[PDB]
Amino acid sequence: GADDVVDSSKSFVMENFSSYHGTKPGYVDSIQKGIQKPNYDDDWKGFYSTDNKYDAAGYSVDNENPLSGKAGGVVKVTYPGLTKVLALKVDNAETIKKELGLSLTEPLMEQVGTEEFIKRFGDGASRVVLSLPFAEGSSSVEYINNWEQAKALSVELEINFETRGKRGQDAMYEYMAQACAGSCINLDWDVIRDKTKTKIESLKEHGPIKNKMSESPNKTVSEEKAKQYLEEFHQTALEHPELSELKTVTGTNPVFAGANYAAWAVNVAQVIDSETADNLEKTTAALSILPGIGSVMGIADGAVHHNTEEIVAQSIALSSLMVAQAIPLVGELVDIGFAAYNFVESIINLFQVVHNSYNRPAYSPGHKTQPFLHDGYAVSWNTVEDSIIRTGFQGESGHDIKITAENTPLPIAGVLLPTIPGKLDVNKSKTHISVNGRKIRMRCRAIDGDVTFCRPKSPVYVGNGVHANLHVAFHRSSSEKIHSNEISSDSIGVLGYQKTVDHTKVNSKLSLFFEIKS
Amino acid sequence: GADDVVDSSKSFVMENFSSYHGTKPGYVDSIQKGIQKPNYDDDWKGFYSTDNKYDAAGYSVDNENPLSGKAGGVVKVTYPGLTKVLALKVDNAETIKKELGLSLTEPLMEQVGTEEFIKRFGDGASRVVLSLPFAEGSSSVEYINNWEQAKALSVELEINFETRGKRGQDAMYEYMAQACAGSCINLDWDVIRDKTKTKIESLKEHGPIKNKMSESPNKTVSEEKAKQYLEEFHQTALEHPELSELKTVTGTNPVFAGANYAAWAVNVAQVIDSETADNLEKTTAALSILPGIGSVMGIADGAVHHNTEEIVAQSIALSSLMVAQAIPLVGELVDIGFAAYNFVESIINLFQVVHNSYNRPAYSPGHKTQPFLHDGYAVSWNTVEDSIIRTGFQGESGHDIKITAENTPLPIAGVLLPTIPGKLDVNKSKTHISVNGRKIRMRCRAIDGDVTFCRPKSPVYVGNGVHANLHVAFHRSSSEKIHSNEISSDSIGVLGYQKTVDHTKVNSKLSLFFEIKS
Amino acid sequence: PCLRKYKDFCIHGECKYVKELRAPSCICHPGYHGERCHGLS
Amino acid sequence: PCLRKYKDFCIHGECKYVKELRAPSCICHPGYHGERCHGLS
């Protein structure tokens, strides 16, 4: 059954099939002459490319020093004549060979290169290239070329990061930022490096800073008393004119509090030692497994708040001055050289990794199967289809929402359902919540014509070991499709316990966003 | 296509098909004479029963006063002769009729009662009964009987709660507790009612209590200052000999702290008013949407810690005395009558609901698709199949684990994979984590022969808007099935940031439990 | 009650008093979230 | 290192020092969880 493993919708033949390849450093010039060959699944031996040059870029780092090496480049490889791209529904070679009726006793990619396979599944092309979804959470695909067929490729250079001779991996990430800059963080790290250096020296030569630097006990102390110094040093340091903009964007969000920079400074001091502090790979390595970084990065609530070269520089500068105060209080090394040197370099690298994550497309909390985590609860659509509300027909549809809580028993007061009378109304009887098997019916009631409210008949609690599934049933009386202007809200509001938000008693709202389709 | 909507594996014919039905109060005697007939989907008009008498019990409450009414009973209904149970793969009548080729212009349950349907799908029986999974998260099924065919049923009584004349719904929950008592909380609420009453009066007549009762400002005050009084009152009250056992089981867990009973007392005071305080339904209603109840229930970490009549009584007693102190400080009613009266009754009812949840079978955090929520992270198996590791064959298998974090950027240091050499080893190359589309490879390494450790090549952070999918690939060299004794660990340890647990720096472990099968 | 007492409570959403629970609510406009529909995403 | 320094750290699990991260770890026995494999579930 070829229809069982080959996704024909995504399979096709084209003239001059082109793709991209991430080229490690030192291989940029050599690869521009031809594709040449040098696991537990011998079947996938082959040359790998991708339909996305930006993803391809990601693969241009030293496999030796993966965290903080230098970048190589990206090349565009093209096949002359016709090439068949056979997209696959699975990545299990054994299962593929069975369903495709092949030699179960030989590697898969080698059979993909034989004329027998190129004849049968080739639909005309000179060679075949396997195509599998790049990864979970992406639209890009991964092209697996047969080693033999791949010598036929024509390599042309697209970008060369090493050629830009830029610090760390700046060139590489500057390139990837283009993906969205056609949120979208497109920063100039050179500028950020400049501003940071300038500010670190300015802070050091500031009266109050020096003044506070003296109040430092300067020898190892308990981390409880250390934080208190750093927090005070923080408040003081943040007063400096150079850091004016940080003082402002920082005063509101708790994540960005001085206590947070303080605990961060201490964490760093505790894990870096003379050995580590000397090596860039080793440092970045230690730093990357520490919590509280969003505090210095200005990342919280699904957003990168430190969106400018100016603020980014100010945050790193402050973090570096703090780390320098922290080292003698609980560290064990050459007290400061690290803070303005390696620490800045590693941290800059981590910022770049996280910024890259936010620039990439993604589903927000409550969308598709992504959980929405709020006030101790964790809700999400059972499946992607559940998040999709179809229209243009008369009839029912049901929607499952997984709900649970982190620990102690938390209530579920009821649920708010957006409605469009005639095209989308709540089926009051096919709608319920089941808590650990207990199917509990709900008392629904159209508050407005815009929203119905359903409340469980018997109390509903969720927690560690107590999960529930809310089943929203919709009914359509008109076979006319819902029109955009009609959509007054695109989410289902599950209500938790009663809290006090800005002086008003309201219930915790956990949102499950949906999409109207068909 | 009948095979598309009828689950034949769960379909069958049997002599004297019997099932259970939850009977509302006032209908216990009448229903024992015969099944007689009295939504948006007219198709499911019918008499509903279930294969589980305990679930059936749940449905014996006043539909009028669903939260705290009285219980009716359960009856066993049997069909004479042969009955065909046609289990269905879906609950969409329209889809069922199409695939079963029926009149799309008439209700479903009515066609299920016609001889035409009883002939075709009946496989011999006199009538057919539809069977659908009771709910999500249960093994019980729901039987939908045709109204006509159901007069043929023979009703025999199983249990009558109203006949036990027990307070609230005690009879009903005592019955349900039997489900596990063949954790398993099987309490004697009569005893708990006794002990609570005795303790409330003993506390009231205790010197220190009266002594502290006087330090009460007795008129409305800020809730900040109110808590402080209640917390002090708490510490004092907890000293009383009657509450010795509570003082002990409470001193360790933070959830059970005096601050927690204090904030609870205040919450209650703030939502109950003269109207509410007078009605049992209205009270229980208000109470049920308040957080912090696990504090008085002694529920936390997936366990009901207040497992005895004695401790349960002590907790409720203390909670009642506190609520009485709280009322004048922020309430607005007949100051106390409520606390020893209605409050105790409602709270007792809520305890019963939650205890019932823990007695019911359920998947713990990290099992099947249930998320494991720890240190800000939220991980879980992408699908149920992912949580199942098969054996008894040579070859691969892949396993997806959804990972994310509530807010700020949290790291993923790497992952610990349990292994059984020869039967289950890590496929180092088919194993990776993809963060928002970015496929990141991993450096794996057998620490022991018992566990391999994989670390991401480039740093991995997850958070609000940054999700990831860890793909563990397993390889089998022996076609011999893994034997129980061999299984030295049944979970995958995803490591988060580095914390300090009991003096040792360790990484946050988020566990995904699996099952070896086939 | 959304007119008088709970006016301006809801930011990016429509105010609807939920009688049963005796509290206002905010039906967040497309893409917004929050008790007061303060944020987008 | 599990012998000397990190002895008794792991409750219901086997201690394994993870060199890369420079810290011990506990491979929880069937059904246990926790950094120290303290709890069942």
Swiss-Prot record, chains A, B:
SUPFAM superfamilies: ADP-ribosylation, Diphtheria toxin, C-terminal domain, Diphtheria toxin, middle domain. It catalyses: diphthamide-[translation elongation factor 2] + NAD(+) = N-(ADP-D-ribosyl)diphthamide-[translation elongation factor 2] + nicotinamide + H(+). GO terms for molecular function: identical protein binding; NAD+-diphthamide ADP-ribosyltransferase activity; nucleotidyltransferase activity; protein transmembrane transporter activity; toxin activity. NAD(+) binds at H21, Y59. The record marks W147 as: Modification inactivates enzyme. Its EC number is 2.4.2.36. Keywords: Cleavage on pair of basic residues, Disulfide bond, Glycosyltransferase, NAD, Nucleotidyltransferase, Signal, Toxin, Transferase. It holds the Pfam family Diphtheria_C. Homodimer. Diphtheria toxin, produced by a phage infecting Corynebacterium diphtheriae, is a proenzyme that, after activation, catalyzes the covalent attachment of the ADP ribose moiety of NAD to eukaryotic elongation factor 2 (eEF-2). Fragment A is the catalytic portion responsible for enzymatic ADP-ribosylation of elongation factor 2, while fragment B is responsible for binding of toxin to cell receptors and entry of fragment A. This is Diphtheria toxin. It comes from Corynephage beta. The lineage of its organism: Viruses, Duplodnaviria, Heunggongvirae, Uroviricota, Caudoviricetes.
Swiss-Prot record, chains C, D:
Residues 1-38 form the EGF-like domain. It comes from the Eukaryota. It is found in: Secreted, Extracellular space. Disulfide bonds join C2-C15, C10-C26, C28-C37. The record marks E35 as: Plays a critical role in diphtheria toxin binding and toxin sensitivity. This is Heparin-binding EGF-like growth factor. The lineage of its organism: Eukaryota, Metazoa, Chordata, Craniata, Vertebrata. The chain holds residues 107 to 147 of 208 of the full protein.
